[PDB]
Amino acid sequence: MLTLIQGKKIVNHLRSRLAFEYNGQLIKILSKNIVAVGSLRREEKMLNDVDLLIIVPEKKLLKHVLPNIRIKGLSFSVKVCGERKCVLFIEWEKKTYQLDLFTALAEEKPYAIFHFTGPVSYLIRIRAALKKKNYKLNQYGLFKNQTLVPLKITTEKELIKELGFTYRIPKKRL
Amino acid sequence: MLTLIQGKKIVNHLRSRLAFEYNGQLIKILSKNIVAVGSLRREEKMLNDVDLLIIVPEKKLLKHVLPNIRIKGLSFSVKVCGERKCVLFIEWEKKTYQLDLFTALAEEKPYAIFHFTGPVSYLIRIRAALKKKNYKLNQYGLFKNQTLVPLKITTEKELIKELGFTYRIPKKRL
DNA sequence: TGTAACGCACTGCCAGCGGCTCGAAATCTCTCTCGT
């Protein structure tokens, strides 16, 4: 486990040294499209692991980003990897911790941000009330009978207000 | 062979005890989506066999319903079976009779109902005049030059009226 | 009229390139532990 600041100290070092491989074109990942999430964003004092989200602008990239990711200047290993989820072990300063990496689409940004902020308990209560209203909520979008519900929102905050719930900052979510 | 009422007495026993298997999930068949046809619906005195139509709501289900059909509390056999037609011999009251089972989609309902009601002669005479007008009639739909002709109808009666023919109740059809 | 389930010859067709067979290669679905 790592302290909150231990996780904080790591995040800033990464935003510059990011790239994924694709037809020889190693393409850097921009810090704007990067959002920190998980217990980290919840500002919990002690971190069980580290959780990061990625804003992917184009749909086809999915099958090439996470599978062919690259890391500058860090010893690491690969356990499991798909197009949406990727979990890697790392060697930061002689200790080993677990890291979680997820990708999301430009229209899923507020739906995704909200989901991965957590925690689980907070999310269940919302999905419970929506399941009691014939709705299905996930990190991608909102459904009714598997039919998308488009809302005139952009940020995670707008979504929660449009969902009709009391907005709460990460650490207030529980 | 069975009397008219003999088949009817059976039909009510079946509408409750019907199911088809699908990925271990045994799915019951609802009595609303069940319609009786053939010599039975025609109210003919003596029945050579029993004929039932089924309203399947979804297209993918076709290759799973009739092939994997199940009956509660009855020993039965299978003669021939596909996704559209299924013929079974049965043991009702120690005697052996033949049974016919057909499937149709929720949108094929009025076109299907008309077809399987019969009788043969009545159907041929109608379809003959339609063949003289570049039309093709079947249990599925209506065509002109192999292009489906959609009509603003729902029930078989509406279809017959839109076809422009004298409506006849089953026993009156001949 | 207008059609379905079937079994057969005839391919074509790839796991196989010669066979019409068994079960391969690859494209599936099911569950299971995971992830917030």
Residue numbers in the entry:
A (entry chain B), B (entry chain A): 1 to 174
Paper passage:
Interestingly, the same catalytic motif of 8–17 DNAzyme has been independently isolated under different selection conditions and using different cation cofactors, indicating that this small DNAzyme is efficient and its catalytic core motif is ubiquitous in the sequence space. The central catalytic core of 8–17 DNAzyme is flankedbytwo substrate-recognizing arms, which bind to the RNA substrate via the canonical Watson–Crick base pairing. The Dz36/substrate complexes assemble into a “V” shape with two arms (P1 and P2) orientated ~70° with respect to each other in all the three structures. Unexpectedly, the catalytic core forms a compact small DNA pseudoknot consisting of two short duplexes (P3 and P4) perpendicular to each other.
Two types of non-cleavable 23-nt substrate analogs, including one native DNA and one DNA with 2′-OMe-G at the cleavage site, were utilized in the structural studies. To test whether O2′ could affect the local conformation of the catalytic core and to shed more light on the catalytic mechanism of the DNAzyme, 2′-OMe protection was introduced to the cleavage site (rG-1) of the DNAzyme(2′-OMe-G) structure.
